[PDB]
Each structure stands twice: as structure tokens, then as C-alpha cells.
Amino acid sequence: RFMTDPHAMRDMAGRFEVHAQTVEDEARRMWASAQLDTMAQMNQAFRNIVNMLHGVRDGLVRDANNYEQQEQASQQI
Amino acid sequence: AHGAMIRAQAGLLEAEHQAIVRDVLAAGDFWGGAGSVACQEFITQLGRNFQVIYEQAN
């Protein structure tokens, strides 16, 4: 299962990190093409998106760690 | 032509959106299933933000 697979979980984190990176890049270009409250709304939507993608990334990494932790906490000895 | 750029960058952003939904579906178990209300809310909130950007670009 996916959530019992530290390696798959850490791979997917990768993919989500790449999406964050892509969307950060497209935001900077897009903000540039935009040359003040409409600007705020866009800036905000962009950040919201990048944060969600950071969450999944941090969540998957945390979970991959914690699963490895559950395993070693019940073998040591 | 500065309008063309913005529209294009938007199409580009919309492709990203779609690529992310395909990955959220592939990582559906993270939210306790791809069909879980946790997953669908994530998606719904994702669309709300892309919609904002899309709108103001068009």
C-alpha cells in the first residue's frame, strides 16, 4: 500500500515539489506580464496554491519518516 | 501581444492544474482515499484558486 511505502511516499513528495516549483515559476512570469487589488487576488491565489502543494509535500515526507520510526521502535532490542 | 502572453501563460497554468489533479488522484491514499471528502475538498480548493487566476487573466 502507498502509505506503507516510504519510498513511494517520498517519490510522490518529489512530484509535488516539482509542481510547487512549476507554479512558483509561472506565477513570477505571470505577475511580470501583469506589469492593484486584482493583483492582490492573484498573488493570494498563487500563494494558496503553493502552500497546499507544500503541505502535501511536507505531509508525505513526515509520514515516510514516521512509518520508518514505527518500524524501528519495534525492532530495537 | 502582451495580452497574448497572459492568455498563454494562463493555458500553461491550467495544464499545471490538471497535472496536479492527476497526481492528487495518484496519491489519493494520502487523504484516506481518492474519493474521500478530504481529497475532494483539497481538489475543490485547488480549483477555486486556479479559477481566480484564470478569470483575471481572461
Residue numbers in the entry:
A (entry chain B): 4 to 38, 54 to 95
B (entry chain A): 12 to 69
The authors write:
Of particular interest are the Esx complexes which are dimers of two subunits (ESAT-6, early secreted antigen of 6 kDa; and CFP-10, culture filtrate protein of 10 kDa) and which are secreted across the cytoplasmic membrane by Type VII secretion (T7S) systems. Mycobacterial ESX secretion systems have been shown to be involved in a variety of physiological processes including conjugation in a non-pathogenic mycobacterium, iron and/or zinc acquisition by both pathogenic and non-pathogenic mycobacterial species, and virulence of pathogenic mycobacteria. The overall architecture of the complexes is similar to known Esx structures in that each heterodimer forms a four helix bundle with the CFP-10 and ESAT-6 subunit homologs each contributing an α-helical hairpin to the complex. The subunit interfaces in the four-helix bundles of the Esx complexes are similar to those of the previously determined Esx complex structures in that the intermolecular interface between the CFP-10 and ESAT-6 subunits is largely hydrophobic.
A crude low resolution model of the SeMet-labeled EsxEFma complex was used to obtain a molecular replacement solution for a high resolution (1.96 Å) EsxEFma native dataset and a second crystal form of EsxOPmt, solved by molecular replacement using the EsxOPmt model from form I, at 2.55 Å was also obtained. The asymmetric units for the EsxEFma crystal forms have a single complex in the asymmetric unit for the SeMet-labeled protein and six complexes in the asymmetric unit of the native protein crystal form while the EsxGHms and EsxOPmt (both crystal forms) contain two heterodimeric complexes. The WXG-containing loops are well ordered in the EsxGHms complexes and in most of the EsxEFma complexes but the majority of the connecting loops are disordered in the EsxOPmt subunit structures. Additional regions of disorder are found at the N- and C-termini of the complexes with the EsxFma and EsxOmt subunits having a substantial number of disordered residues at their C-termini. The average amount of buried surface area in the subunit interfaces varies considerably [EsxEFma, ∼1605 Å2; EsxGHms, ∼1555 Å2; EsxOPmt (form I), ∼1025 Å2; and EsxOPmt (form II), ∼1175 Å2] and the percentage of the surface of each subunit buried in the complex interface is also highly variable, from 13.5–33%, and is related to the degree to which the termini of the subunits are ordered and to the conformations that they adopt. Shape complementarity (Sc) statistics of 0.77 for EsxEFma, 0.74 for EsxGHms, and 0.69 and 0.71 for EsxOPmt forms I and II, respectively, indicate that the interfaces are highly complementary, with biologically significant interfaces such as antibody-antigen interactions generally having values in the range of 0.65–0.85.
